[PDB]
Design a protein around this ligand. Structure first.
Ligand code: XE
Ligand code: XE
Length: 263
């Protein structure tokens, strides 16, 4: 809806920074609404959904098991590792690592999962063989959040991400079980509170994954809808602003309020 794009134009002018935005119908797959859809934005933690999609593709093929246990050392711990820091002795299963990566944005969980699939280049190869030849991962956590302006490393476009998310969620690649698992993780996201969820009515379904990094970078990808069922995928990034994380949150939330109002 036009009013939602005013809000994106609002946010962009207020934050003084680029903002990309996609509304995508989950059923027909048709773009409902767009803004800077072909510009690149840092993915930040929003990559962890694609990472687990790749892990789950390996699980589907028997190259990986969700119950396999991974042990690690304290030296492998990087910044912000709420769950993985607590299991140095007993390790974690691949399922537990994807749960921590998606629901809590656990950084060490991401790197460990990246090692299982063969690194960022292997994740980019996965996305490439999915029809996404735009999205790329180059670095590990936490260096992938550097968000250097015009740096194409660790970036995606709003249109590439929304399409990739739709295929991961409602495509034919992953098995029906792996698709339900990936969205289950997104639905139990514990670190996206003040964003899209804040403008969301009771009874609505939402599964998401947010990101934040350097140089005013903030974002969110989400599959949401009323009556307990998802019906649209929405993508929103921003980068460059000197604004606080609080004002970034409140901008994404306002655009979300207009999206909801105009459903
Ligand atoms: Xe934004
Ligand atoms: Xe949003």
């Amino acid at each position: 809806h036009p009013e939602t794009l005013v809000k994106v134009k609002d946010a962009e002018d207020q934050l003084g920074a680029r903002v990309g935005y996609i509304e995508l119908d989950l059923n027909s797959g048709k773009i409902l609404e767009s803004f800077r859809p072909e510009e690149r934005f840092p993915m930040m933690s929003t990559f962890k959904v694609l990472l687990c999609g790749a892990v789950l593709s390996r699980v589907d093929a028997g190259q990986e098991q969700l119950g396999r246990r991974i042990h690690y050392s304290q030296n492998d711990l990087v910044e912000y590792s709420p769950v993985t820091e607590k299991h140095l002795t007993d390790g974690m299963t691949v399922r537990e690592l994807c749960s921590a990566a998606i629901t809590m944005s656990d950084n060490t969980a991401a790197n460990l999962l990246l090692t299982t699939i063969g690194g960022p280049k292997e994740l980019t190869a996965f996305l490439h063989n999915m029809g996404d030849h735009v999205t790329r991962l180059d670095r590990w956590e936490p260096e992938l959040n550097e968000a250097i302006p015009n740096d194409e490393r660790d970036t995606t476009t709003p249109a590439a991400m929304a399409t990739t998310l739709r295929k991961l969620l409602t495509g034919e690649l992953l098995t029906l079980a792996s698709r339900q698992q990936l969205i289950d993780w997104m639905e139990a996201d514990k670190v996206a509170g003040p964003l899209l969820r804040s403008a969301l009515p009771a009874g609505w379904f939402i599964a998401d994954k947010s990101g934040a990094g350097e140089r005013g970078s903030r974002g969110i990808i989400a599959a949401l809808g009323p009556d307990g069922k998802p019906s649209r995928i929405v993508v929103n990034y921003t980068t460059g602003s000197q604004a606080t994380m609080d004002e970034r949150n409140r901008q994404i939330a306002e655009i979300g309020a207009s999206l909801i109002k105009h459903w």
